[PDB]
């Protein structure tokens, strides 16, 4: 795991125009958000997730990282511009493909929540959970 | 660290023509080898490291990962073709840049050894140590 940790920490995540380090994730719940500019149900969900994040990410101590299924860089940028959170850089498609496989992401939009420190999965149903609990009263929607 | 571990594990390392996963690193000493096709002292050291690896990587339980300072992809491939070990993919320049910063790699060839499981640094002087101990009798050349 140690080597993997160093390689992971060597990845710079996008933060809008900037790129950032990973310490900022310490002690938070972190979500990977699998979505694409071209996906119609994503287009309906992303605005709700944006609103939920702006309102609750501080108080509920979470971060979101876009894991984009856009393969065109201009579409990737147009879409990420609408988001207030972080992204795996467009160039790191390999990483998105691997995470997609890891979490059995068979459709989008999908939101996978995990403990930043342990790496343990917290929730795989947060896309559907959030639509039913827009206030986040049952956040982080733990599986089972 | 958990998020970083998942991102690291999502990176596929090059293994010659193939790309491989990271479990294969379990319980080994792992070295990052910082070098470039264009570097004259690298050209003199790489053949010795190749010979040392072929002879000892199994019995001394270690792996090597190229962290290339080549910025041209054809030169990167020509050079890596001479190596029997693994590489960070050419496309993952960002990662090489970060690891270079992390381990204060100010010149090449440089060999940085670490425990694969803990991630802890074992040796930062292995380039010079190996030339003086070609049999690896003092492997892994622990610092201080
Ligand atoms: Mg690092
Ligand atoms: Mg914030
Ligand atoms: Mg980008
Ligand atoms: Mg990648
Ligand atoms: Mg979901
Ligand atoms: Mg992974
Ligand atoms: Mg071998
Ligand atoms: Mg490559
Ligand atoms: Mg990279
Ligand atoms: Mg060295």
Author numbering:
A (entry chain A), B (entry chain A): 2 to 145
Please give me the paper's original passages concerning this structure.
The crystal structure of cytosolic LmTXN was determined at 1.8 Å resolution. The crystal belongs to the space group C2221 and contains one protein molecule (residues 2–145), five Mg2+ ions and 66 water molecules per asymmetric unit. Accordingly, all the secondary structural elements as well as the overall fold displayed by the TXN family members are conserved, apart from the N-terminus. LmTXN was crystallized with one macromolecule per asymmetric unit, but in the crystal extensive contacts exist between two adjacent monomers, indicating a possible dimeric assembly with potential biological relevance. LmTXN displays an unusual N-terminal α-helix which allows the formation of a stable domain-swapped dimer. Solution experiment indicate that a monomer-dimer equilibrium is present allowing discrete dimer formation under physiological protein concentrations. Interestingly, the refined S-S distance is 2.66 Å, intermediate between an oxidized (2.0–2.1 Å) and a reduced disulfide bridge (higher than 3.0 Å).
Leishmania reduces the hydrogen peroxide produced by macrophages during the infection by means of the tryparedoxin/tryparedoxin peroxidase couple.
